[PDB]
Amino acid sequence: CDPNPCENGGICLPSFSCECPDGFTDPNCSSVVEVASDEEEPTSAGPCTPNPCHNGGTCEISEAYRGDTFIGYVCKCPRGFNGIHCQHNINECEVEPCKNGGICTDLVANYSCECPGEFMGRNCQYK
Ligand SMILES: *[C@@H]1O[C@H](CO)[C@@H](O)[C@H](O)[C@H]1NC(C)=O
Ligand SMILES: *[C@@H]1O[C@H](CO)[C@H](O)[C@H](O)[C@H]1NC(C)=O
Ligand SMILES: *[C@@H]1O[C@@H](C)[C@@H](O)[C@@H](O)[C@@H]1O
Ligand SMILES: [Ca+2]
């Protein structure tokens, strides 16, 4: 058995199948067995509910620590955004795309340029 497919410490026999110890269940001994008091015990919703991600990000379960805290998810950001929660509109003016003294304005996944006189072009690249 490739080294352990089974989480929670279930023993694996061969493609592969896992003997689940007392309290665990498929898939790969990752799930829950219960009795009466378990229901009426408060459920936690997932790390993705409610959605932690802003700006249209996609929350995904992952092996993720912020510092020494296991947060168990990451946010997949759309073009133009970043940050742990996708909270940041990326500043596309940081890398100074407007040349020859042009002034950059920031847009979602884009920028535009106002050109000092006699310079022209999308990037002010032309004199
Ligand atoms: C916005 O970004 C797209 C993608 O690069 C680009 O083709 C387009 O020129 C931009 N829109 C503007 C500012 O005209
Ligand atoms: C888990 O907790 C949330 C918080 O209110 C909801 O009550 C949810 O309904 C619970 N889980 C289940 C079993 O639906
Ligand atoms: C998850 O990924 C992010 C980046 C967006 O594409 C969402 O539409 C999708 O659900
Ligand atoms: Ca931007």
Side-chain angles (χ1 to χ4, degrees), residues 13 30 93 106:
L13 342 121
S30 303
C93 298
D106 189 52

mmCIF file of all heavy atoms in Angstrom, residues 13 30 93 106:
data_model
loop_
_atom_site.group_PDB
_atom_site.id
_atom_site.type_symbol
_atom_site.label_atom_id
_atom_site.label_comp_id
_atom_site.label_asym_id
_atom_site.label_seq_id
_atom_site.Cartn_x
_atom_site.Cartn_y
_atom_site.Cartn_z
ATOM 1 N N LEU A 13 -5.359 -2.410 3.281
ATOM 2 C CA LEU A 13 -4.975 -3.615 2.553
ATOM 3 C C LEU A 13 -5.335 -3.458 1.080
ATOM 4 O O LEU A 13 -6.355 -2.854 0.749
ATOM 5 C CB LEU A 13 -5.672 -4.859 3.115
ATOM 6 C CG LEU A 13 -6.303 -4.840 4.508
ATOM 7 C CD1 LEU A 13 -7.782 -5.172 4.390
ATOM 8 C CD2 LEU A 13 -5.595 -5.822 5.433
ATOM 9 N N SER A 30 -11.978 9.399 6.605
ATOM 10 C CA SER A 30 -12.076 10.828 6.898
ATOM 11 C C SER A 30 -13.428 11.266 7.489
ATOM 12 O O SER A 30 -13.554 12.381 7.987
ATOM 13 C CB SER A 30 -11.758 11.649 5.646
ATOM 14 O OG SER A 30 -10.473 11.325 5.135
ATOM 15 N N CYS A 93 -0.917 50.164 -11.662
ATOM 16 C CA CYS A 93 -0.078 51.328 -11.836
ATOM 17 C C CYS A 93 1.264 51.183 -11.149
ATOM 18 O O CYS A 93 2.166 51.915 -11.486
ATOM 19 C CB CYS A 93 -0.798 52.569 -11.316
ATOM 20 S SG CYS A 93 -2.310 52.905 -12.197
ATOM 21 N N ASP A 106 -5.985 53.345 -12.504
ATOM 22 C CA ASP A 106 -6.160 51.926 -12.250
ATOM 23 C C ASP A 106 -7.580 51.446 -12.535
ATOM 24 O O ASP A 106 -8.543 52.092 -12.123
ATOM 25 C CB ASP A 106 -5.841 51.669 -10.791
ATOM 26 C CG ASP A 106 -5.788 50.220 -10.484
ATOM 27 O OD1 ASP A 106 -5.048 49.533 -11.216
ATOM 28 O OD2 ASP A 106 -6.501 49.755 -9.549
#
